[PDB]
Write an enzyme that holds these catalytic residues in place. Sequence first.
Site, PDB file in Angstrom:
ATOM      1  N   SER A  11      -0.796  15.548 -12.032  1.00 11.92           N
ATOM      2  CA  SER A  11      -1.025  15.182 -13.415  1.00 11.92           C
ATOM      3  C   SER A  11      -1.275  16.441 -14.237  1.00 11.92           C
ATOM      4  O   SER A  11      -1.812  17.435 -13.741  1.00 11.92           O
ATOM      5  CB  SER A  11      -2.231  14.245 -13.496  1.00 11.92           C
ATOM      6  OG  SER A  11      -2.622  13.978 -14.826  1.00 11.92           O
ATOM      7  N   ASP A  38       0.835  -1.198   0.000  1.00 14.11           N
ATOM      8  CA  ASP A  38       0.000   0.000   0.000  1.00 14.11           C
ATOM      9  C   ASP A  38       0.874   1.254   0.000  1.00 14.11           C
ATOM     10  O   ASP A  38       1.359   1.676   1.056  1.00 14.11           O
ATOM     11  CB  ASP A  38      -0.895  -0.025   1.230  1.00 14.11           C
ATOM     12  CG  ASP A  38      -1.808   1.165   1.306  1.00 14.11           C
ATOM     13  OD1 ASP A  38      -1.923   1.892   0.308  1.00 14.11           O
ATOM     14  OD2 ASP A  38      -2.406   1.372   2.388  1.00 14.11           O
TER      15      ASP A  38
END
EC number: 3.4.23.22
Length: 330
Positions: A199, A35
């Site tokens: 992004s 994770d």
Amino acid sequence: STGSATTTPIDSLDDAYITPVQIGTPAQTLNLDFDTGSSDLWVFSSETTASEVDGQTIYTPSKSTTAKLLSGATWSISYGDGSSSSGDVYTDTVSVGGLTVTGQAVESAKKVSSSFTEDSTIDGLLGLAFSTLNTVSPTQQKTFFDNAKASLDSPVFTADLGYHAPGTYNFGFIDTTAYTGSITYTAVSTKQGFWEWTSTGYAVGSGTFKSTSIDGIADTGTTLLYLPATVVSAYWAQVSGAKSSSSVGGYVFPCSATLPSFTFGVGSARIVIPGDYIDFGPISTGSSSCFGGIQSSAGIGINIFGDVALKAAFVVFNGATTPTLGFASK
């Protein structure tokens, strides 16, 4: 040193991925959920409340000649999905894919929430976010990667998750045969303890690319892709009959649909998520309404590039003094 381990989907939907981890001496192999959105290595154990164990493999520290109780140390964690766990702490030898750390903090669960009990395939979590998020008290502990870093050939790990198939986690090296083209690196903020990046935009299907900054985290422990409501609406508007269902808890779509791809930007590069990766199947057994793999992050407080996004790429988690992320197509 290096390590390399195969990671395997837990079910036919890729709801999560499990990677075998050797703990203790002799080794006890547990299948952990790696994770990159958390920083605790915790396991089902011989100390876990018996009614809260239902098919998981447990760590028994008393059978490990290298286990040592970390005196006075406790841990307690709550995840973004509402699940939680807590317990005490041992140090022990932990190996992943041939890479060994001695003295790793292994957080032994005394209590786990129902969602963990109900998932027999996941024996615990191995956190790969920054050690500042580790919950051990009163002495915070380091992640497996943090402990291994100085010994690695290069201070990196890579995630290469498969679509409906196994993939690979590598530590200490970049497998140049595992991707196409080049790896585009992008800046990371560690201020919230995550692999947080920005992004450069998105496209839906064959549509034009929208240049827009989308801050979010690269999180292997989250199944889906969670993005701003504007972006998510633009995606599902291209699927006839798709709608947000308050009762189901997100966007659903007719199982008869063919889904468009979704592209996200990494600098000037583009990662294309095929439409099929966005199908999470019937909302309940036998339903013709299917659950979408792109969902709104509104109310979560952060955008999450979970497995839906990451499995479309070869992803480099560069833990150099100034961390960065790398993405390549594959």
